Amino acid sequence: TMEELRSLMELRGTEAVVKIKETYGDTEAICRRLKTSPVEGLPGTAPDLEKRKQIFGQNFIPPKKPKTFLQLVWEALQDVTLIILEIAAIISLGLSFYAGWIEGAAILLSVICVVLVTAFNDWSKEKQFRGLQSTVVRAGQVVQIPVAEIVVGDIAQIKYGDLLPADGLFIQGNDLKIDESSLTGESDQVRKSVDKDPMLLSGTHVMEGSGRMVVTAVGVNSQTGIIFTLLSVLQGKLTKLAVQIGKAGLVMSAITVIILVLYFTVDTFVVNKKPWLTECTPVYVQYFVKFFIIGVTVLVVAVPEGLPLAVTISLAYSVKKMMKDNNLVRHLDACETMGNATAICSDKTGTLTTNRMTVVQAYVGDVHYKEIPDPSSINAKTLELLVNAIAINSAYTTKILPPEKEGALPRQVGNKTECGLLGFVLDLRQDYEPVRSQMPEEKLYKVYTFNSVRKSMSTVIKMPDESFRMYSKGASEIVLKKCCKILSGAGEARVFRPRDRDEMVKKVIEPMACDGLRTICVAYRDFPSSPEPDWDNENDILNELTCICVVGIEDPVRPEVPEAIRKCQRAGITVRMVTGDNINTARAIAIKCGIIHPGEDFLCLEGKEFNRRIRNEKGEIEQERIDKIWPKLRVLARSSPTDKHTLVKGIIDSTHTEQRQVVAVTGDGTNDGPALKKADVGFAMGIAGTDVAKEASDIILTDDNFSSIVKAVMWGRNVYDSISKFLQFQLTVNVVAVIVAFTGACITQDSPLKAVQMLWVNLIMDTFASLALATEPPTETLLLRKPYGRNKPLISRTMMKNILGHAVYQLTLIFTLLFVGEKMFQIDSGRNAPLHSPPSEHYTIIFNTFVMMQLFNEINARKIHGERNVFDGIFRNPIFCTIVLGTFAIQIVIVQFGGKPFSCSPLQLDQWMWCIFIGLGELVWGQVIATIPTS
Amino acid sequence: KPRIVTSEEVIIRESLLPVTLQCNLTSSSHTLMYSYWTRNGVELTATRKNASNMEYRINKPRAEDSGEYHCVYHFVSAPKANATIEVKAAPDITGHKRSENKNEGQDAMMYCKSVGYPHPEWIWRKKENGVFEEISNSSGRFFITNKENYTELSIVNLQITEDPGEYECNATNSIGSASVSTVLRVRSHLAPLWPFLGILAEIIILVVIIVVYE
Ligand SMILES: Nc1ncnc2c1ncn2[C@@H]1O[C@H](COP(=O)(O)OP(=O)(O)NP(=O)(O)O)[C@@H](O)[C@H]1O
Ligand SMILES: *[C@@H]1O[C@H](CO)[C@@H](O)[C@H](O)[C@H]1NC(C)=O
Ligand SMILES: *[C@@H]1O[C@H](CO)[C@@H](O)[C@H](O)[C@H]1NC(C)=O
Ligand SMILES: *[C@@H]1O[C@H](CO)[C@@H](O)[C@H](O)[C@H]1NC(C)=O
Ligand SMILES: *[C@@H]1O[C@H](CO)[C@@H](O)[C@H](O)[C@H]1NC(C)=O
Ligand SMILES: *[C@@H]1O[C@H](CO)[C@@H](O)[C@H](O)[C@H]1NC(C)=O
Ligand SMILES: *[C@@H]1O[C@H](CO)[C@@H](O)[C@H](O)[C@H]1NC(C)=O
Ligand SMILES: [Ca+2]
Ligand SMILES: [Mg+2]
Numbered sequence A: 001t002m003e004e005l006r007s008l009m010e011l012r013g014t015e016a017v018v019k020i021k022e023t024y025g026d027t028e029a030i031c032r033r034l035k036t037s038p039v040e041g042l043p044g045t046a047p048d049l050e051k052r053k054q055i056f057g058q059n060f061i062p063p064k065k066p067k068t069f070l071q072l073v074w075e076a077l078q079d080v081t082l083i084i085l086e087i088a089a090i091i092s093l094g095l096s097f098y099a100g101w102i103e104g105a106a107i108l109l110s111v112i113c114v115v116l117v118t119a120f121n122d123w124s125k126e127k128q129f130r131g132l133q134s135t136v137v138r139a140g141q142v143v144q145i146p147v148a149e150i151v152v153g154d155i156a157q158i159k160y161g162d163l164l165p166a167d168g169l170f171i172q173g174n175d176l177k178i179d180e181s182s183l184t185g186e187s188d189q190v191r192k193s194v195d196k197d198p199m200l201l202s203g204t205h206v207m208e209g210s211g212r213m214v215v216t217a218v219g220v221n222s223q224t225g226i227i228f229t230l231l232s233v234l235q236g237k238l239t240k241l242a243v244q245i246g247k248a249g250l251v252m253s254a255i256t257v258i259i260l261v262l263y264f265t266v267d268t269f270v271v272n273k274k275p276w277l278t279e280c281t282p283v284y285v286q287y288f289v290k291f292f293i294i295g296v297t298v299l300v301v302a303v304p305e306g307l308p309l310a311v312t313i314s315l316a317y318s319v320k321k322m323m324k325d326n327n328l329v330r331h332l333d334a335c336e337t338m339g340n341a342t343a344i345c346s347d348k349t350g351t352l353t354t355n356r357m358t359v360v361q362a363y364v365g366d367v368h369y370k371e372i373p374d375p376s377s378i379n380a381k382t383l384e385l386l387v388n389a390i391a392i393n394s395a396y397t398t399k400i401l402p403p404e405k406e407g408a409l410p411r412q413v414g415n416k417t418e419c420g421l422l423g424f425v426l427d428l429r430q431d432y433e434p435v436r437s438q439m440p441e442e443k444l445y446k447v448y449t450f451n452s453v454r455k456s457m458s459t460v461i462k463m464p465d466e467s468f469r470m471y472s473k474g475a476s477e478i479v480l481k482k483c484c485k486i487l488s489g490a491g492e493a494r495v496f497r498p499r500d501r502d503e504m505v506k507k508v509i510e511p512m513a514c515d516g517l518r519t520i521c522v523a524y525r526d527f528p529s530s531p532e533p534d535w536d537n538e539n540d541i542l543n544e545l546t547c548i549c550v551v552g553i554e555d556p557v558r559p560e561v562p563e564a565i566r567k568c569q570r571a572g573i574t575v576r577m578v579t580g581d582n583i584n585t586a587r588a589i590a591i592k593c594g595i596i597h598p599g600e601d602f603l604c605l606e607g608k609e610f611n612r613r614i615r616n617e618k619g620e621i622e623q624e625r626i627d628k629i630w631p632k633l634r635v636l637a638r639s640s641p642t643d644k645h646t647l648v649k650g651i652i653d654s655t656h657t658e659q660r661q662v663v664a665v666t667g668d669g670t671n672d673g674p675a676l677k678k679a680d681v682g683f684a685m686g687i688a689g690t691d692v693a694k695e696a697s698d699i700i701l702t703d704d705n706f707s708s709i710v711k712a713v714m715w716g717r718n719v720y721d722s723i724s725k726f727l728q729f730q731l732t733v734n735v736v737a738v739i740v741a742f743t744g745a746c747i748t749q750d751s752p753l754k755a756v757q758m759l760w761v762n763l764i765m766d767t768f769a770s771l772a773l774a775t776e777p778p779t780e781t782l783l784l785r786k787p788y789g790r791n792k793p794l795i796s797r798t799m800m801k802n803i804l805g806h807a808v809y810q811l812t813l814i815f816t817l818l819f820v821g822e823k824m825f826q827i828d829s830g831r832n833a834p835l836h837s838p839p840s841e842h843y844t845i846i847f848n849t850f851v852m853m854q855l856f857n858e859i860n861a862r863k864i865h866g867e868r869n870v871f872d873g874i875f876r877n878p879i880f881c882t883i884v885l886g887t888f889a890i891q892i893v894i895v896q897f898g899g900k901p902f903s904c905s906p907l908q909l910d911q912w913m914w915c916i917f918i919g920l921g922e923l924v925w926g927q928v929i930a931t932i933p934t935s
Numbered sequence B: 001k002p003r004i005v006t007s008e009e010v011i012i013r014e015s016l017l018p019v020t021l022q023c024n025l026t027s028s029s030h031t032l033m034y035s036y037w038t039r040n041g042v043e044l045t046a047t048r049k050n051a052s053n054m055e056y057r058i059n060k061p062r063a064e065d066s067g068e069y070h071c072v073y074h075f076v077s078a079p080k081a082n083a084t085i086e087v088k089a090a091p092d093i094t095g096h097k098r099s100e101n102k103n104e105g106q107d108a109m110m111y112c113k114s115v116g117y118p119h120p121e122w123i124w125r126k127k128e129n130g131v132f133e134e135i136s137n138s139s140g141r142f143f144i145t146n147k148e149n150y151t152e153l154s155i156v157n158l159q160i161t162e163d164p165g166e167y168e169c170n171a172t173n174s175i176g177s178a179s180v181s182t183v184l185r186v187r188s189h190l191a192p193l194w195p196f197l198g199i200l201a202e203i204i205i206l207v208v209i210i211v212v213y214e
Helices: A002-009 A015-024 A046-052 A069-077 A080-096 A101-132 A223-230 A233-271 A278-302 A307-325 A334-340 A348-352 A383-391 A416-427 A498-514 A561-570 A583-593 A607-613 A623-627 A641-653 A674-678 A707-744 A755-773 A797-824 A841-860 A878-897 A909-929 B191-213
Strands: A155-158 A167-179 A189-191 A205-217 A327-329 A343-347 A358-364 A367-369 A446-448 A457-461 A469-474 A483-488 A492-495 A518-525 A545-554 A574-578 A663-667 A681-685 A699-701 B003-006 B019-027 B032-039 B053-058 B068-075 B085-096 B099-103 B108-117 B124-128 B131-134 B142-146 B151-155 B165-169 B180-187
Touching (some): A002 A015, A069 A080, A069 A101, A080 A101, A080 A233, A101 A307, A155 A167, A233 A278, A233 A307, A233 A707, A278 A707, A278 A755, A307 A327, A307 A334, A307 A707, A307 A755, A327 A707, A334 A681, A334 A707, A343 A348, A348 A583, A358 A498, A383 A518, A416 A545, A483 A518, A498 A545, A498 A583, A561 A574, A561 A583, A561 A707, A574 A583, A623 A641, A641 A663, A641 A674, A663 A674, A707 A755, A707 A841, A755 A878, A797 A909, A841 A909, B019 B032, B019 B085, B032 B053
Parallel strands (some): A343 A574, A343 A663, A483 A545, A681 A699, B099 B180
Antiparallel strands (some): A167 A205, A446 A457, A457 A469, A469 A518, A518 A545, B003 B019, B019 B053, B032 B068, B068 B085, B124 B131, B124 B165, B165 B180
16 A cells, blocks of 8 residues: 555654665565566556556645635625725615615626626636646656656656656665755755665755656655645735725715705705704705715715726736747736846856757868868868767767658757767768667766766777777867877877967867857877776876867857847846856857947956955855946856856845846756746746746746747836826826816705716726726837836826826816806706706716716827827727727717616707717817926 | 575685685575585595585695685485685796707797686787787797696797797786796707817817827
8 A cells, every 4th residue: 555655754764774674675675566667667558557556546636726706706805995885885775765776786886897807807817827837757668758647656767957746765876966845844955865865755856966766656645745735016006096095085075075064054044044844854864865975976986996907907918918929927926027127137058049059160180160071071090080989978868860840950859069069970971870889888887977067078988909998078178188199180199288289279269269169179098908097086087188179069049139138228128148158158159149249348257256256254245245246247157056146146135226126037957946036037948947947937938039038028018007097097087076076066056967977987987997998908119118116106297297187178178068058058057956856958968078078088098108199009909999989889878868867868969969079179188288398 | 495605705815824614504405415515626535524514624725725616515305506615816837848949840839837716817928129028920830729727839830030039928817917937949950060060170180180290
């Protein structure tokens, strides 16, 4: 049973050794019980899976999903803004019965719409997140198998950066170190080994080394599964704005009710003598009820219930539309933070370059070739040695495969520099198969592993009789100086001396580096082998080499990034490059990308200099020392994984520059965990990205292009802009509305707009402005403005100028109508109408003009930056056009066939045409107000 | 013939004093069955008793109460005796339309209903140069109908240049007179054309500003 094994491995201490030795011996003693052949593996047949997983039950089922549609509806119902609206609707509905009921339904409808929309989008987002994010190196067979299937017995091959998907006993490997903080809370690197601690845990990250594991059980019984089962500055500013608007609306409503009641009582009792006869009590309370309801409706108009809906709608729309732009977003708040991004710290390979290594230049036969040569040009006795020193030197698993799809390129699968070397050998019209096939591991015994510590890989071959043949590939500076002879001319082994190599470095190596070529060197040696050399002393066993040829590999810069970086620099964003290549190649590629221009003063210091110049007091890191480097730093070559982290920490935490900095970090690799989390937003790599760098990031780039990042920036800014324009429209409306009520209670003794009409206006403004003005598509004009500050206010200068100007026009038109409409239209005045009076067409005209002005100003409110052509891009958003036309048609039907319940009297044709004339005049006034300098 | 002695006629003024109307069946040789008050031919509610002498009291007399009252005496085997007590009061206009808006080439209708008794004589007037003149049938397009309350003035084939104005019913009676006014407006046929010419004048200058800006 898996339960016994789980309880066995739960010890998690030094006693496991004892237990394993005392009961289960070694791995193979009881591996037969698990039904698993280590060396042979498992073919992967369905009956075998069923037999070995007879009691598996199921895999790690996704979370229970407690959030249903009803649960989300209940959660969204208890919103602070909607509580006021629903409470007020309850008061209105209760107060009606004493068509008054038609008031409450309106409020209810608004609430219903909001909650439904919110719930729907939330549920939709969750489904998308489940659908988008759900071959595993733990294959079992020699061929790779998909991630989904996970079986008990599979032989995992573990590499650095693999996220362990299950639990299993260790088998074999080199210096495997794992971070178990996901389980222990301790961030120390546990070194795994058969003799001390051979267990491997799901959910833990491989930091170093490599190996194999025989999983104890597929069954998700690992400690991480057990514990997991057992388990916004803009938003704050918007909440503050909403509460201030609510307070102002409440004050205005209270004042309106007090003024109305004071007028009624003083006029009816004191100015004119009328006793409080009991028989007139109903009338005297009906008046009060009316006044109260008016006040209540004013409040529900002034309360901005469409702001949170607008925020959620814009965020959901942007997140959905980013996926079709090769950005997939995991954390929602990263969508808008990228709008303010002021720095990007990316890496050269993978992101800025296509990461395809090809050979374009060579230095062979003491001659420098700028193109791939003919096989006859190179003298004999050298090509054979070069093929031997390239094919057998390293990584027999770096096979070159034909594309065999739509005439694509022959993509490489292993170490890319060695892949470029094999490509160069193949392009010499030769083949490495006749060499690799005749040289298996048979005599391949002494191999030095490849790592950044040595930057070189070497092998010994026993084929030379009574001799050896050392091979070496190096970084042209670590290994090149170690050689002692040059295979120059017609195979002659000339003497290598410090004199001529110094001139050779400036002769060929420097131009190669300046062309953006990474320079590597190939060397060979022949040991006498009569006395067996002690090969443990790396200092001497790698010297006395003989250089064969020096070749410069390259990876072309992507065609899109030279313009993407230009757009980034135009939008106020500064981009730096962090790379492990030598400084010459890094600078050469950073000039082709456009990061650093040929004429300027930009630092290009190396990693060692960077560490030296930021540590003055012993080894302590001082922010003052960092603050003198990062402002003018563009290239960081020969870096370390900790160097990126310390640069990000120095940039983010600096208080030197006049503006706080928000940085974005592109990462890929094992040790890009802390550096990718200290940043404000992290970008993981789609295809080349390891699981450790994907579980710490905020956004994942599907196509790996740097030019995707720029799109993200644009899609961030749009979000902000969307909210802004909505705010604009909303504010204008309610300003006018409130003022009208407060001037209806003083000059006359009633508001010119009744309660149900005001609720229709509130429905339009809040719900439909949130739905229509928050789905505006983005334009390339967004990437032309410097990134916004941190304490920048929501209501910018142009927005408040638009609010004031359009409010002025609407107020003057409404007051002129209200006081002179009996004479302008010859329509009989509707002022001072007694209680329970039939509707007039003096007030229906005012209501109709108000609504038409609101619609034609909603068209205007799509431009925040003083743009004049309002209709630009209006047909790219069918929701806007649909909502505006539907509102127009509903207004027509309400005015015509919507009589006594809505307090509307039917209008003729010329009155309708005059209302439309005044609305279009609002458009023309918007044109007028745009020609005023806000400065 | 039974003899009934009735109270004198009463003129309802603005005074709040209740008014009592009395009938006395002073001479009758028949077995009386019952009696009741009637106003304008409508039997008043809860007025049927023995009531060889019958009383009716109005606690708040108004112009709406005034009318031709009767106290009908029904006998077992004799014809009913009704008599009459008239309650006079000045007339008051209770209903009219504030204004009448109509398209030219159409009909117009105005009315003035009133309450009182004796029923009034309805004459109409038209306000010209600040004083009310008499209506004139100088084209045969004016129709006046007179009833007890209802009066109705009808106009056919409205002319924009002449008809519009304010008219006034006049409701006269021996006690007094009352009057109200009605405004008649005739709308031109070319009304929906001026705003249309406005709308075009806003489009062809909203376009010009935009395309010049580009
Ligand atoms: N297969 C190889 N054998 C020997 N040396 C190699 C090999 N591949 C690369 N090198 C060299 O040794 C170092 C290996 O660095 P590598 O891991 O390729 O990253 P980098 O190119 O230095 N930086 P980056 O581009 O950001 O990944 C470099 O100096 C290479 O020039
Ligand atoms: C009232 O009663 C008297 C006494 O019986 C009788 O003579 C007279 O006819 C009655 N009148 C009615 C019933 O109307
Ligand atoms: C009229 O009838 C009433 C009620 O019975 C009586 O009091 C009064 O005396 C009568 N008057 C005459 C004149 O008969
Ligand atoms: C009573 O009869 C007379 C008969 O001349 C009639 O004029 C009168 O209207 C009648 N009263 C009622 C109330 O019908
Ligand atoms: C006006 O004259 C017409 C036509 O002779 C007639 O039908 C109508 O009744 C008259 N009206 C008045 C008020 O004289
Ligand atoms: C007018 O007189 C009629 C009878 O012809 C009557 O039914 C109606 O109630 C009276 N009053 C009004 C205001 O119409
Ligand atoms: C009705 O006649 C009376 C008495 O002169 C007057 O009060 C009223 O104004 C007259 N009506 C018209 C229409 O002139
Ligand atoms: Ca509202
Ligand atoms: Mg590296």
